[PDB]
Structure formats: C-alpha cells, structure tokens
C-alpha cells in the first residue's frame, strides 16, 4: 500500500507467422507480408506497351 | 518486373517478436499501439499506448518496404530461355547462363530477407530496451525492476505519475525523501 | 543476333549482380560501423558506471552527477580507470538519502 | 555545492554526409569516403604494361 505496480509490456496477437533469420530458422512474429509475387491474372493485358 | 527465384515463399517480418504464454509475456489485448503502459493501483488495471515510440517503429517498418518494393530494373530484349529442339553447344551455354543466374538471385533473395528480418526483430527489441532504460533514467532509487519489464515504484503515485511518465516529465521528488523508511531499514 | 545477344546478356547479368553486391556491402558495413561506434561509447559509460557506485546518478544524457565531492583529481583518476571512490563515500546517507 | 557534474559526451562536426544503412536510408555521419572511382585522367599511362 506504499507502492504502485507499473508495467510496460509489449503487444501480442493470437495468430502469428514463422519466419527465418540469420540466427534462428523459425521465429513467430505478429505479422508478415509475402515478398514473392505468384499467380497473376492469366490474360496478357494490352497497356501500356503496344 | 521482379526477378525470378526458385523459392516458393519468403516471408518478410513486419512486426515484433511473438511471445505466446526479460518481459515475461505478451498481453494479446493491446491493439491500439505498439508500446504502452500497464498499471495496478486501487482502481484496477488499464492499457494505453505511447505514440512517439509507436510511430518511430512504424516509420522504420514502412522504410523497409520502400527499399524493397517497387525498386526493379527494366529489361526488354533478352535471350531465349526455352527451347523446342536439341541443338547442343550453343543451347547448352544459353541453358547454363540462365541456371547460374537463377541460382545467384535465388541465393540473394534468401539472404536478403534473412538479414533484414533478423535486423528488424533486433531493432524492435532495441526500441523496447531504450524505452525501459529511458524510464529507468527518469526514475531513480524510487522503484525496483522485477525482471519482467515492470517497475514497482517505492514512491506513492496515483495515475498522475503515469501520465507524467508517458511524456517524460515525471518529477520523482515529491515523496522521495522518506526513502530510508521506504524499503531500506536496518 | 544470337551470339551477340548472349555476350550482351552475359555482361548485363554480371553488372546487375555486382551492382547489387556493392550496394549491399556498403549498407551492411555502414550499419555495423555505426553500431560499433555506439557500442564503444556505451561500454565506456558502463565501465565508468561500474568503477563508480552509488556516489553518482545518471541524468539520462550521458552525464553523471557525482554525490561525492571531487576537485579535478577525480576526473583525472576516471580517465585512467584508477578512481577510488572511497574517500567521502561513508557520509552517503546524509548525501541524497534522507528520511 | 556537494556535487561535480561529470559529462562524457561525444564529438560533432558542422558539415555531415548522408549515408544508407540496413535500417535507415539517410543518416548523417561526420565524414565519409567515396568507394566508386570516377573520371580518371584521360591519358593511357605507359607503365607497367608494355
């Protein structure tokens, strides 16, 4: 009763994605984005090259 | 267009370490900011965000995408890369040139993400340590580290202290003198 | 045509790979160099902190206020890592820590 | 009057140069050197190749 606990902490999410780093093959982060594009539309669209 | 690589997936981290269970564990309920304060007093438990540290981290993550996304080099007429008939020597060389090139870019892409991803996780960790150290330096002998990122403050405060902490203006010297009675006996 | 296209393609592939390597090389080395120079300062700060004790407080901007009277002789002893804090140290409770 | 402020600090310069790092596109340092040579003399010097 002479104190006031003070916590800083950090955020978290329930769903995470595993990524690779230099020192760890599998570490879960709160969010990730795909860096390799794959499987676009399927038609060769005409613009802007003739 | 982006460069062809052999890997089917390469995930670039865009957030901090995920700890699902120093800071002993995450909260999974602070969704309005990246950094913040949790307190316990007579009135309860609460959550808030620190905007300056949040924005500093967010700016850095957007900085990584800007370095990697939409930064490509134009190629037009190249060499043929698929062949319908066996030709031997010249076709072997064209095939060998492409296979060597693909292996070198596939390596580069794998290493690029691994270096950037490791560093991003370290930079998000660094900001937390700086905030902890900054709070520690503002404070003094009026609190003790419990080892899980929280300080027990050995100086009575009633929410006004927390507000002063978030903007770095807390003046510890109000209750500070009765320090020996507080914690340090004989 | 064909043979000249290949010679042109070989050089263009090679130039892109060295241009990438050079850009990344400087970026990796430069980040680490800036980190190593920061590290040496922190180590020096920590080393000074460890030589010292409860006789000073960190104001948060790399400076220590020393709660033990020194008159330049302390500073000289600090630079060569031989400062012996124990001369004024005992009157510590009167200094800073009241009731 | 019972204290002696002690500052360690670090040096600075008025003129700085912006460089790129892994985590920051633009950071100013006190000094830098160029790693790409450009615009040499204009004469082919005769030594040491024949």
Descriptive labels:
mainly beta; part of a larger assembly; 50 residues; 4 chains; two-stranded antiparallel sheet
Strand order across the largest sheet of chain A: 2-3
By helix and strand content of chain A, what is the structural category? Answer: mainly beta
Number of DSSP-assigned strands of chain A: 4
Largest sheet of chain A: 2 strands, antiparallel
Query: End-to-end distance of chain A, in Å?
Result: 78 Å
Number of distinct helices of chain A? 0
Q: Greatest contact pair?
A: A-B, 34 and 61 residues
Rg of chain A (C-alpha, Å):
22 Å
Overview of this structure, please?
This is part of a larger assembly, with four copies of chain A. The first copy, chain A, is mostly beta strands and 50 residues long. Chain A contains no helices and four strands. Chain A has a two-stranded antiparallel ribbon. In chain A, β2 and β3 form a beta hairpin. The N and C termini of chain A lie far apart (78 Å).
